[PDB]
């Protein structure tokens, strides 16, 4: 089992297109794990995949993308579906980070950080994690430093993703150090 490719398939089902797998996510993103497995088994590549394989995929991952609880599974962040995933509001640390591509910096300066295709702006707890986010689009990514606690004190909402991935509503440029 190629766990990296399996994770990409699971991400598509749990973040982007659950309907394509015949799945319906609840308000917090959960779906029955046997329903996900049944849907994965529609694809020739994944007919061997067991629940055990999903736990191992999670255990071996660089990132805490998914969690399995009481026979249900969800993605913790990254969703793009029309129905807003309900996340817990959370006061952020003083500073969070956002790694991006050079070609987006002018637009972020003018408009702030926007959720774009996702439901939430995604932020990083540390510099190295943020640079890895930016490296997905740019070999020379730009580190943005977000005055997150200041933004929160002025009404910008932040939400729990995981220990390394923070979520937010749109963040005005005034809170972003370039
Ligand atoms: N006003 C504006 N004008 C122009 N561009 C703007 C803009 N505001 C923001 N942008 C940029 O628009 C891109 C959005 O791109 P994305 O939706 O992929 O967000 P992201 O890059 O944060 O990545 C999410 C997670 O996906 C991966 O997680 P996984 O590995 O899949 O688990 C990562 O690790 C993350 O945690 C980003 O470049 C923004 O900088």
Author numbering: 4 to 181
Task: Quote the authors verbatim.
The Tpt1 mechanism comprises two chemical steps in which: (i) the RNA 2′-PO4 reacts with NAD+ to expel nicotinamide and form a 2′-phospho-ADP-ribosylated RNA intermediate; and (ii) transesterification of the ADP-ribose 2′′-OH to the RNA 2′-PO4 displaces the RNA 2′-OH and generates ADP-ribose-1″,2″-cyclic phosphate. We succeeded in growing crystals of Tpt1 from the mesothermophilic bacterium Clostridium thermocellum (Cth) using recombinant CthTpt1 produced in E. coli. The refined Tpt1 structure (Rwork/Rfree 16.16/18.57) comprised a continuous polypeptide from Leu3 to Glu182, consisting of nine β strands, six α helices, and four 310 helices, organized into two distinct lobes spanning amino acids 1–85 and 86–182, respectively.
To explore this point, we mutated Cys46 to serine, produced Tpt1-C46S in E. coli, crystallized the C46S mutant, and determined its structure at 1.6 Å resolution.
